[PDB]
């Protein structure tokens, strides 16, 4: 999986 900073 994965994950994402904005």
Given at each position: ?6
């Amino acid at each position: 999986g994965g994950y994402m900073l904005g």
